[PDB]
Design a protein around this ligand. Structure first.
Ligand code: 1TR
Length: 802
């Protein structure tokens, strides 16, 4: 006897009763393959993929006068008739009679939907069915196991060793699985091929001049030099048994990556250049230019590559292969091996005479960067001033205040910096005084103090006092010189105000104020309801008199839909977002959930395009360009939005966009398979269920551009049924109205609405640069957009709300 027990706690249950085991014969597999080819999502799949889906189909036995489907109840199965007959009845009235070969319940595989008509067995028959969960999981596995198999083979190949993880994953998607039956030539000797083949499963025989050299098993490959150069095949490879080979073509590689020698050399040179502290601060575009214009030469052993007289404008040297011994006059100062480099002093001092001497120890391959190579890269002959200008640029470009300014405004601010020295113990800043300067440490260390208590230390390239440029508030902490004679680059408020203009200054002024206000729930007074779904309310902060927007996500709504973990990941995405065209979060409360954000008063983008009607080229460029930068920012942070549409975009008082709904957004790490988003704006790869990445938002971008230029949606405008919207997205024809007279608009819209993500614009190694450099944006200034220097299409007269 103890004083201290706990109790324990639709369509699937109905089909479970009719289920029965049966051996999958050859005659049964043939009719499944035939009917699945007529299906909407299995048409794109190959025979090996359809053969796997045929094995997971379960056999169901029915009797004459038995209910199969119910009208209004959720749809989870898709059936293929084997024997007997099934009459379709709609609203208690007959419609059609089916037989062997036909199928029904196609929409259930893509998404959960209520059926329209009932299906009853008229005669004694049997069905071949498959569930949504089982079907979608099999597509996910076929796609995931194929990509992981292909990626493992891309790693085993030696020509792709210097490619990055992102570059390796892109060429894995370009793989095409080519099947070869016994006694079928894969490649012939003498032919000029452009394909790389790897054995996934099976055996193949080699034949140089019709003589057997060896036998190739799984893992072996051939055609590395075919992807690089136009050379003939050294042997004739023939299949001994039924082989399957993963094939990468040079034509598809040029679309995804471009010239492979250029991409590999850019990675080699970037890795070699990033070892030096000078080129560590250079941008990726600048480092690629140096690699594209570097002089690569081969030298024998014991050869003076560079001598005091025979320099020929060389400022930097990188060893690609072999070894070189560095010398100063007649004294050795080091030995550089593969990857190592030299020249930092000559790169920094353009006019300095070359005193060192480089001599090869063995046969080597050396890359050389001259002064003209550095001048064309930096875009100015004064290399010493440009490197110092880039060093300052690299520091200020990492800060929100100067990141989004135009390059002209950014260069004037960099040119306006002045250096000043501070002795030991000198107060740069004193807490309580109203400062008017922003500082960047050039050389030395400085201690941060408040009430005689050391909070932290700042060294070379660190910065402080950026708030003084936007306000006339007193300094919070004092900055004392810890080290001797510390140098500091500084810019006055007067100078900053002359460069920056009204719109951007207003955006920075009221945005940076939000981080200082300490907000608790008790002082937020509710003015009015602005949104509804889950509800958004306009709130007034009584102490600071600043107006904000407050979301109210109900806990019962999250628990009912089973979004306990997804709401936690939404908080992580929304809080980390810090971009001028994305909503800025202040603080999140809980007890139901809440999200306090900035108040966006200019109205909705949905209503803005209705007020303007069909947008023109300057108006469509502005809104799509504003969306591109917000989506590019999320793609750079490995976040996929999955729900891009004008309904989830608001306009601010200045007329600039603001992205807001991050419910469907997710931090991607590989390939996502969950079907989410709005049907009209969803991409085909989401519907097909064979994996998708950040490329889905570039499809929705094309759908937005289509609405702006043309008016209606490109796929299923009048259609309300999800199946018919999804059918128009996959099998439908993309057409354009007769009033659209611009070629560049149509060319961009067609390239953005390209079903295959490999061939879609902006889904290559270059990324959004391909969309940004398109003929549609020829006259568009991307610097002036982010810096709030363009006149927007529509400006709100006062405030607007839904
Ligand atoms: C879909 N729309 C037609 C309805 C609508 C309208 C405004 N918001 C906001 C909104 C945002 C800013 N300013 C303001 N004023 N409204 C937000 C929002 C989103 C996330 C948050 F954490 C806080 C607020 N959501 C909506 C939805």
């Amino acid at each position: 006897r103890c004083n201290e027990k706990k109790a324990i706690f639709g369509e699937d249950t109905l089909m479970e009763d009719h289920l029965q085991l049966r051996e999958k014969l050859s005659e049964d597999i043939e009719m499944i393959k035939a009917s699945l080819k007529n299906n909407l999502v299995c048409s794109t799949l190959n025979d090996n993929e359809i053969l796997t889906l045929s094995n997971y189909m379960q056999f169901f036995v029915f009797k004459g006068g038995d209910l199969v489907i119910k009208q209004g109840e959720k749809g989870s199965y898709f059936f293929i008739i084997n024997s007997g007959k099934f009459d379709v009845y709609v609203n208690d009235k007959k419609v059609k009679s089916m037989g062997k070969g036909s199928s029904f319940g196609e929409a259930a595989l893509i998404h959960n939907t209520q059926r329209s008509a009932t299906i009853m067995a008229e005669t004694d028959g049997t069905l071949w069915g498959v569930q949504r969960s089982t079907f979608r999981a099999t597509l996910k596995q076929l796609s995931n196991r194929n990509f992981n198999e292909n990626r493992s083979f891309i790693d085993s190949v030696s020509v792709f060793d210097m490619l990055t993880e992102a570059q390796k994953n892109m060429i894995t998607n370009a793989c095409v699985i080519q099947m070869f039956k016994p006694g079928e030539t894969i490649v012939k000797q003498g032919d000029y091929g452009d394909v790389l083949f790897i054995l996934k499963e099976g055996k193949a025989t080699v034949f140089i001049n019709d003589k057997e050299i060896r036998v190739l098993n799984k893992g072996s490959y051939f055609g590395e030099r075919a992807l690089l150069y136009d050379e003939p095949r050294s042997a004739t490879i023939i299949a001994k048994e039924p082989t399957a080979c993963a094939s990468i073509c040079r034509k598809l590689l040029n679309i995804v990556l471009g010239n492979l020698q250029v991409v590999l050399f850019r990675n080699i040179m970037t890795e070699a250049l990033q070892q030096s502290e000078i080129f560590r601060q250079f941008s990726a575009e600048q480092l690629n230019d140096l690699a594209d214009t570097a002089i690569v030469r081969d030298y024998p052993a014991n050869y003076h590559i560079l001598h005091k007289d025979k320099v020929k404008s060389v400022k930097y040297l990188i060893v690609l292969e072999g070894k070189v011994e560095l010398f100063l006059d007649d004294e050795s100062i080091g030995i550089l091996t593969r990857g190592k480099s030299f020249g930092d002093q000559y790169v920094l001092n353009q006019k300095q005479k070359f005193r060192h001497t480089v001599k090869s120890l063995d046969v080597c391959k050396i890359a050389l960067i001259t002064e003209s190579c550095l001048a064309d890269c930096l875009g100015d002959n004064n290399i010493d001033a440009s490197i110092d200008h880039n060093n300052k640029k690299s520091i200020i470009k990492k800060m929100y205040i100067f990141r989004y300014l135009s390059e002209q405004q950014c260069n004037l601010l960099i040119e306006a910096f002045r250096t000043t020295r501070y002795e030991e113990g000198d107060y740069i800043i004193q807490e309580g005084e109203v400062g008017s300067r922003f500082y960047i440490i050039k050389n030395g260390e400085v201690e941060v103090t408040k009430n005689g208590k050391r909070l932290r230390t700042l060294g070379k390239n660190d910065y402080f006092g950026e708030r003084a440029l936007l306000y006339d508030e007193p300094r919070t902490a004092s900055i004392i010189s810890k080290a001797t004679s510390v140098e500091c680059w500084f810019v006055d408020k007067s100078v900053f105000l002359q460069i920056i203009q009204g719109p951007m200054l207003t955006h920075l002024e009221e945005r940076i104020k939000m981080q200082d206000t300490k907000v608790e729930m008790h002082e937020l007074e509710t003015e009015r309801i602005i949104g509804r779904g889950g509800t958004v309310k306009l709130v007034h902060h009584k102490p600071t008199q600043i107006r904000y927007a407050l979301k109210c996500v109900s806990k019962r709504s999250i628990i009912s839909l089973n979004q306990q973990n997804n709401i936690k990941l939404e908080r992580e995405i929304t809080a980390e977002n810090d971009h001028p065209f994305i909503i800025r979060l202040v603080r999140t409360f809980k007890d139901c959930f809440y999200f306090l954000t900035e108040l966006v008063t200019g109205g909705e983008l949905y209503d803005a395009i209705r007020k303007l009607g069909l947008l023109s080229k300057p108006q469509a460029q502005f809104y799509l360009g504003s969306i591109i930068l917000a989506i590019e920012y999320l793609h750079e942070r490995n976040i996929v939005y999955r729900d891009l549409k004008p309904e989830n975009i608001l306009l601010d008082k200045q007329g600039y966009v603001k992205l807001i709904d991050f419910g469907c957004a997710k931090k991607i790490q590989g390939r996502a398979y969950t079907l989410v988003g709005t049907p009209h704006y969803m991409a085909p790869e989401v519907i097909l269920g064979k994996g998708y990445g950040c490329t889905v938002d570039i499809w929705a971008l094309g759908v937005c551009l289509y609405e702006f230029i043309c008016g209606p949606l490109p796929f299923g405008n009048d259609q309300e049924d999800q199946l018919e919207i999804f059918r128009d997205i996959l099998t439908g024809q993309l057409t354009f109205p007769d009033y659209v007279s611009d070629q560049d608009s149509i060319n961009l819209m067609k390239r953005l609405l390209c079903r295959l993500p490999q061939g879609r614009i902006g889904c290559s190694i270059n990324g959004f640069k391909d969309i940004k450099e398109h003929a549609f944006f020829g006259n568009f200034n991307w610097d002036k957009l982010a810096g709030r220097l363009l006149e927007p299409p529509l400006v709100s007269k006062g405030e607007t709300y839904a």
